[PDB]
Amino acid sequence: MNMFSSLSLVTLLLLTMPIMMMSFNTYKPSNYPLYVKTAISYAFITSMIPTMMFIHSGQELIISNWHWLTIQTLKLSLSFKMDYFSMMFIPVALFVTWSIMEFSMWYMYSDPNINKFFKYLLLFLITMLILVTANNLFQLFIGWEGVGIMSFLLIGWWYGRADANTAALQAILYNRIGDIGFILAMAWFLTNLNTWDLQQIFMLNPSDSNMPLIGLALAATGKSAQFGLHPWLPSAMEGPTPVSALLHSSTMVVAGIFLLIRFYPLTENNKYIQSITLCLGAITTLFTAMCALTQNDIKKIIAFSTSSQLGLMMVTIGINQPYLAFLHICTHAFFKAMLFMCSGSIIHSLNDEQDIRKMGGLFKAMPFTTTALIVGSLALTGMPFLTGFYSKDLIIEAANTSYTNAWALLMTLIATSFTAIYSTRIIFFALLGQPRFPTLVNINENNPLLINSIKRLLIGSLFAGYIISNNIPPTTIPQMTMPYYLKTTALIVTILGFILALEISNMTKNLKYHYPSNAFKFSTLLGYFPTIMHRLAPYMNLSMSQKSASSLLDLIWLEAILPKTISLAQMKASTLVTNQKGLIKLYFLSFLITILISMILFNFHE
Amino acid sequence: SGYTPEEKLRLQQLRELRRRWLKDQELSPREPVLPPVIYKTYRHSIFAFTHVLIPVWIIHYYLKYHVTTKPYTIVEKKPRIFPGDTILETGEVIPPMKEFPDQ
Amino acid sequence: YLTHQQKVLRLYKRALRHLESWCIHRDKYRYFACLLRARFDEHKNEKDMVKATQLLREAEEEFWHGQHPQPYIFPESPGGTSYERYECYKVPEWCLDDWHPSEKAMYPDYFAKREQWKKLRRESWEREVKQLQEETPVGGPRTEALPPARKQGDLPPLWWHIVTRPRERPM
Amino acid sequence: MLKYIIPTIMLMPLTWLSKNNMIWVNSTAHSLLISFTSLLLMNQFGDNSLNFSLLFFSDSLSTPLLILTMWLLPLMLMASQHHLSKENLTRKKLFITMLISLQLFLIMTFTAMELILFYILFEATLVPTLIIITRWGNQTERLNAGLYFLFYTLAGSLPLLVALIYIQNTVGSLNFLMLQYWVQPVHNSWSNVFMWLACMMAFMVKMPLYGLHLWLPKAHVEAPIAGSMVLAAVLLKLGGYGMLRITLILNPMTDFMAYPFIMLSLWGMIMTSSICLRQTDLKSLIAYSSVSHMALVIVAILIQTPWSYMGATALMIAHGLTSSMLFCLANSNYERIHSRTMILARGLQTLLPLMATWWLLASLTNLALPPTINLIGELFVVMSTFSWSNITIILMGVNMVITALYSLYMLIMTQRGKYTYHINNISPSFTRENALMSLHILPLLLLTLNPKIILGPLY
Amino acid sequence: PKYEASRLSSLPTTLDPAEYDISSETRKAQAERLAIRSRLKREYQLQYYDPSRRGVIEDPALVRWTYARSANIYPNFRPNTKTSLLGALFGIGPLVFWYYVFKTDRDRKEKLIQEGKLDRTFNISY
Amino acid sequence: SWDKDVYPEPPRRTPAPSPQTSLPNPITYLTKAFDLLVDRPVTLVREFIERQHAKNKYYYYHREFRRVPDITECQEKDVLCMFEAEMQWRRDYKVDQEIVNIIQERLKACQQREGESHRQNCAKELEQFTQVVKAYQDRYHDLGAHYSARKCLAKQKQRMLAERKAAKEA
Ligand SMILES: CCCCCCCCCCCCO[C@@H]1O[C@H](CO)[C@@H](O[C@H]2O[C@H](CO)[C@@H](O)[C@H](O)[C@H]2O)[C@H](O)[C@H]1O
């Protein structure tokens, strides 16, 4: 226990040291990025020790080390949950971040604020680890909002660009809408269970859990970009490519799913909540995969790939398979981060070109990025025995054989076919055919930082799923008896997706000119959701602010009904009193009227 | 629809000045005038000492002598016990399961 | 402010770029680029300008129907993925005037040459103002165009913020 | 409290007897020393308040407000000494004297045991505040702002005077310790409805309650920086502190009398938050942000629960430092471009990198990022209003979204984008300005490590 | 299929039928617009390029805009059937609406508590 | 270090190592390295510090509050008696908050300790938590921010009157 708890905390403290060194104590600015990258790699080693101890004997513990605050009967302590979910996620996050940080040392080499960039990446990682190891809701909320704010600063990295500032604020807007659900759950859990600690919530185990769980579902919707609060994630491509790699794999986006996984003891008894998450995930995975089919920006295709894969995780929550949802988070982190890294390699070689229509003919020019891109695409599409197969295929079988919404099941299978199509689209247009890029050839992927960082994620993208699946302890009874057509559905629809994708891709070479359909326009413009919602809602809110709240009310009627009218009455009254003619005759005449009135009317003489 | 002769003359004059300005951005040789495997292991040796060993000493001292001296601050899940296990604390032997029906 | 010729040539360039976005492949784009050029060539010598305007109007309606919903954009063009990316690195030259003397001391040669440019700007300014006065009609300028310098030793009026603007890749 | 009243008084002979060129150095140094000694008021007990004498007492509510008040005086001297540089010596000393006299009234106001004594000092703060705005404000409209400020206060405070004297006739005392034991329930009647309104409206106008807030954006746009700092940081809290005390003797009538003012606050905060999205003047935007934050405090005070009272106290302290920071940040731009228009100077992060960090930190506290005390206070209020009625979470949640939008909008518009080409006088941040910003944020963020000291008596 | 403009999607300039039917009277107006723009451009550039200037080039258009968006409203405000109905509809109406929402919710909750049908088993924080 | 009766713990049952593999256990060697590299040096420093402490032994005490008459024995408006009764009530109220915290802490530790068997093995802790929360709720819930012994007594009498009324009609 002493080694387990000591080493788990040292991992987190190790990550904070490069941040503390920004106080210019013992700093070597020459190579701060190397220093930060070295800290991550050493933290990965230290985190494998408690992870190994958990795998051996299932050792789990909670560290409530610092009493922060007691509010009457609610005691808040800095508490860390070193359990199954935190033991397996932390090494994966650190391993992936290690590659991303090493890659960023090449990708961001010419950025004058590279030191600040690596500090923000490190702060990003710290707030995620706070999120993942939190044992109470207030601590979790610190990490919850921390990753959101770090997303804002990294999406808007190139702050002179209006589109970057717009995308950064859009992430804040959508995530804060999800945060309404988060505070709802906190309020419900305090009022009804008198706690924010996971232990007491699970022990009391409320049966009337609709309200808190809908709040958590809303929080996950925003954070994991499920349908309704989804547009911000593809918009986050404004950030530098290393931001997207980290944002889409080991940090921001999986937090929503992780929040629902942490509360599976409640959701597993709530079929109403299961139905909602099942259908929310199904429409998300289908809709965003459909959007990816026609995107031309490489970073946007992969961004929509993440939204589709997140929706699948949300479907896995819906069918009450939280540990399968968690496994997909871990496997997805490897090949999704690689795919962004490979795309960054292509973008860099083509002088910041991100349109696949201007790529082509790179299969031999960039052999290593090609290999990684092909491996990553095969892992994403569930090629057997690669890292993605050990989660997705189990998820599809579990969904196929579950008691579940039939429509949600069909939408999920179609989205699996669409995954093959849009992965084929990247490979076909980026790597095959003839070059379509400019004439001055500057292709070069021979930097050891680029090669080594992608290499490590390539190895993970092959073996990580096999290694993880063979070491985690069983917590369910996996369904292994089913008809042949329910066992192979994932493989078949994926293969049909590849074949159909090849027909579409090759037809673009025929000397025939085609007009666009409504389906094509609907896919390209993302179902018009950003176009309608991002114009209408801001217009309505911003118009209400100036026209009615500010001018109509605060500069007019609240002025009129009091200070403006009161002043008029006094000014009019003053002119009545003072506009006298100065005549002795008129004043003494009023004296007579006063004396008479005093008696006849008021009887002051009595 | 090309430059007028006056447009051409102005562009030529600004072009001469702009190129002169850009050349004047080059640093002279002395600028900036500044005011006054064995290695690889050692680099990684000093880092491990200062960023792993020293922090773990502090954390272990803090956990052992301050946190674990208070109730319920570190709570372990109790170890799983299986049929046929022996207990260290007592020496108790957990009996085996029944004989399985053949399968 | 656009002539008929300018409108036609803008549509030709715009239509070809959306065609290239649909075709993608260079050999396919070359084929349809020639077909489109032929369509502009058949009505090249139209003289009845009423007919020419109707042809332009109908062509624009055709372009709107057939435009790519997601056309290619050069990375640094407005709406591109690198547009305004380096604006955060562009610092105006007047900021060097506020440098501490020790900061200026690190670049003695750069700041000596900078003083020469400031001297050149100072000694040129009065003549620049006078040239604009004597060349501007009574009611002020009617266009945004500016003239060249006329004599030798003169500089074109209002040159400083063009000549000394930040570099496109300033860091 | 004499150990704080007398050294505060001694600041005035110090300023008037200083060397001509040492008035800022001397007044700043010694008011920091007074601020240091104010930490002795932390001797608070779990059951009893710190009852010094027949005139003055301190408890967990007044203590944090006292420390904020005495901390702000040196910060106000730092912020003012630049725009007052041309002012002649005698008028500089008169300005400092008004700030000192404001602090003296404030520390007596927050520790007065008797409610009528609290009233007189509560009213006395108007005089120096009005003088600071009208005499040293910059624009023509400071005279109107002075009048609106003066008459909004007196329109409410005069009825409070009648109510307070009436209570003393009926109860025999206005000593707050006495009222804790002799309080009797307020029965339903039309006389008691107007007694309730007389007891509350003066504090509502100061908070300010939505609908009685129109004087505050005026006051800020016209006040000098020190006026804005003290107005936002402390003077608004006179209403909250007053409400927290007087609600003792208004039960159970507050059960139903609070409804109209909860509706005004709950809807008011969304309106004022929405208004911030369209404000064109930076000072006016910060002013409307205060109305929205203080609408939370009114709700918290009116629903009277331990969690809401703890949240109200933390919010009052947290907002005091944050809003004072934001005004100081906006003023530092004003001292360069001499305009409050938010859209005038853009992309300032390119020209003032470190000042943009202070802008970021201030904005993050304004939107209540956890675990800042800004968030702790807001969260505690949201928790308690949820029990009051579950539907309030929708209004509370919407305001949180709008608050983030306008806080980051202010940061984005002024610090990011492209710099304005013709504004070529953005000189580097002075040491004074950087120190002023850090003397706000650093105590604010340090309080996160020991929040209990700003949570009030209900802790 | 004709273009249908909306408030949030303007008619493209190339599809505007007034874009092509350009008269000598319309060219005269375009010339006068460019003269105002050019006159203002010159006035700006003479200050912008002046080597001796340090500060802000005050823009009366910006000052007029900020003045109009605040101080100029109430003087030009008239109480009439429009502003009174908008003043009432969005000024008092929401307060009455929310009053009934919260008042009804709290009466229902209080009636259940008194009858002992609201579950407050572990509710000891408020 | 703490009273085991107040913060109880079951006797810990650890299984003995029972390897079924020829591979060495990496955890066994890391445990030895950790004990040698981390624990022993840490223990030496602590023992030096404990020796210094033993040279300067001094004591502090837990304050004892004598009982005084409660608000029920105070004449109306007699502030001197009310004050002492009120302060005592406030001290008891703070103590009752911490008693609930102790029971909640017991409940939370049981839940973690018993793992997947917690729903069955933590019944006694859950029952104790339910009872103290009920008792605490009766005393203090609904009193408002301006609570007092007077308001607490009024609430109790309202509850007593309801209990008597029901008992009569039975
Ligand atoms: C709740 C009770 C509060 C009681 C407070 C009593 C406050 C009394 C304030 C002084 C009243 C008279 O104050 C005086 O009013 C008039 C009318 O508004 C103002 O007059 C001004 O506004 C009017 C209205 O358009 C203009 O026509 C006029 O040209 C202009 O000068 C005077 O400039 C002001 O000096």
Ligand SMILES: CCCCCCCCCCCCO[C@@H]1O[C@H](CO)[C@@H](O[C@H]2O[C@H](CO)[C@@H](O)[C@H](O)[C@H]2O)[C@H](O)[C@H]1O
């Ligand atoms: C018995 C009842 C009367 C009690 C009187 C008790 C105090 C008597 C003080 C007498 C000396 C006053 O001193 C007189 O005022 C001030 C302060 O010193 C001095 O002048 C001052 O100018 C400026 C401030 O304005 C400062 O540089 C400095 O404070 C001082 O030089 C005069 O040069 C001196 O002549």
Ligand SMILES: CCCCCCCCCCCCO[C@@H]1O[C@H](CO)[C@@H](O[C@H]2O[C@H](CO)[C@@H](O)[C@H](O)[C@H]2O)[C@H](O)[C@H]1O
């Ligand atoms: C409900 C509790 C609080 C109620 C407080 C209400 C009392 C009155 C407060 C304001 C008193 C100011 O007194 C007077 O008001 C008017 C406007 O109102 C000001 O006048 C101002 O508004 C008027 C009307 O639009 C304009 O004509 C005038 O040009 C402008 O200066 C006077 O310059 C000021 O002297």
